[PDB]
Amino acid sequence: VGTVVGIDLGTTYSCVGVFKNGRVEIIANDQGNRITPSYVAFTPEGERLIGDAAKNQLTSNPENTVFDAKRLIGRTWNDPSVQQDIKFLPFKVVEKKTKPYIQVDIGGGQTKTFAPEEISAMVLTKMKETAEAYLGKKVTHAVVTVPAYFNDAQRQATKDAGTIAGLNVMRIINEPTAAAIAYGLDKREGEKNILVFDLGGGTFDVSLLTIDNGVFEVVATNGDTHLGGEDFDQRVMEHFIKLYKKKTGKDVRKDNRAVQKLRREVEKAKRALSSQHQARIEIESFYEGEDFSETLTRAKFEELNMDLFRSTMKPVQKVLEDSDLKKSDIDEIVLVGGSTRIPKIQQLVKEFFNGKEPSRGINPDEAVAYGAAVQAGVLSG
Template sequence: MTKETELRHRGWHSPMARDSSVGPQRTGQPLTLNAPFDDEVVQNDMKLFPYNIVNKDGKPYIKIEKDGESKFFSPEEISAMVLTKMKETAEAYLGKKIKDAVVTAPAYFNDAQRQATKDAGVIAGLNVVRIINEPTAAAIAYGLDKKGEEKNILVFDLGGGTLDVSVLAIDNSVFKVLATNGDTHLGGLDFDQRLMDYFIKMINKKHGKDISKDSGALGKLRKECERAKRVLSNQHQVRVEIESLFDGVDFSELLSRACFEELNSDLFKKTMALVKKALEDAGLEKHEIDEIVLVGGSTRIPKVQQLLKEFFDGKEPSKGVNPDEAVAHGAAIQGSVLSGEGGKDTKGIGTYVNSMFCFLSS
């Protein structure tokens, strides 16, 4: 079996996450795999979904209405649809049929959730040859499995919607998860929302217009707030500009990095509290952490990097791997080993919310 690889970052895959007309509610939130309908997490998340979730045989299903007909899809079926499209895209690119895949899953996934992830692959026509933990894959991407000596690694994964903090121990290339912690509702979307709330209040004060129920205006504002957030990772200020935001009124305001940090200060502090809790659960002091690995696009935010460095008394996180691609990169390396190549050249990656797939062509 040979393997060709290409890293592709996908981020949030819900069509509604890409639909700028969706209102102020949180979009793109994934539905938990293999969880009962009455699960506390599912019930809480349902309040945030812009789509209909119903109880079918004790499990949550997504209800779609089209042409007067109702259709119901399980989370596994939705995952499989995305994987099928990814598989087709990879096959078109490689010019080969794909049968096998390496999958990554969050370290906190239980056996049932891992099986559900495998089932999604099977529905998509894939043989899932290996499931590895996402923090382990990230550590592999940084080459930490090749250094030989015993190490303690903290993986800080801050993405679009979730924060996962994992503490790993590695000895002779064998990884052990010592602790996991995090928040499934803390990430880039929340930082965007703080900016939106700030500008909604500003617009109301300056123009006497409440746009909080105007889906068109909110869509434009959400898109511009996300852009501004990204720019502020490299610049100290950015102009937020929206042509004809409402009633033909153009919107233009300067936003500073300091203002962005102040608006999100409690959320940034919360990330460090979760790091502290993960260390406590692992039974380690912060000076016992040998490597800090960053995963997820939101780790590019300077304030996040600053707080991590201060927490670990000046220790710098590992650099050199795109944080958006770290887990995918690690999955690809694992795939190349399983396919017999053993090298670090990586192609053929697809990602979907909680899961990452490295496709292996025969």
């Protein structure tokens, strides 16, 4: 099996880790990033871009970019969830072999269709390449994570994505479990209840797990399938679009690429505001050959999103109800997902649990890959 890698295949961002020289190493991609966008795009010359290069490609044709394949993976075309999601996806989705295939122009007017697992395979291929560059050798085997609520077809389609990518997915493990393993919560005595609060780019998952004898049970799951960091970005986008209109008289949404530029800068500023109190947003040739320069405080970022932040507590309360537990029954709280880097989110979860500190010390957008890599280390032997 060689050196088995651990992969978090995320809706919006993916992460790969390996066990080397006695510990888990989270691997940076060829752009220097320890997470990679689950994104595909095409150049006009017909080059396929994957990851950062695909997300960062300026385009007036969002219909030929592909993302959010995890929303479609392992589902039938006629699945009501698919039919709802296709309303919001800018790329074409068509019924083929009972499934939602993605249809795009890949260069020079050539049209191709891809199954969701074929798009996910492209992302896994990039994750494989990232690991191989670090290791200085090929890898053939992986542990891959999925949401705990994933069903038989979604799990199998994830394994199939691996196969297409040249990875033998040896184990599929649940995301909240992988996070708990990252924090060593499996190597604990007695029965314990663990609440995993996972707030990512596109989705919010809460899971109640019990751990006993090093065996995990997923007791209940809840969340919101379309709440995450992208929604916080959009609140900030709406803020600056409106300010630019009141300031200049003009609506920037007429230019795809301007919106794209602002989105990239807003996301970067949001990330800055998890560790500083103000951030500068600056864009040359933003709109009509005019420059954009604005600032955003942490207080304003929180004010713009407070309702969304506060909405994350309801699914936590539902998971407790469904597990027949009260707050005091929770022995461990694990924060997962990039958006839990937000100070206000950390504050809100602590307050919900009457001052209880969550687990700490692993970057939350890496914790799932980390636990996958822990398991991969044992399988590497």
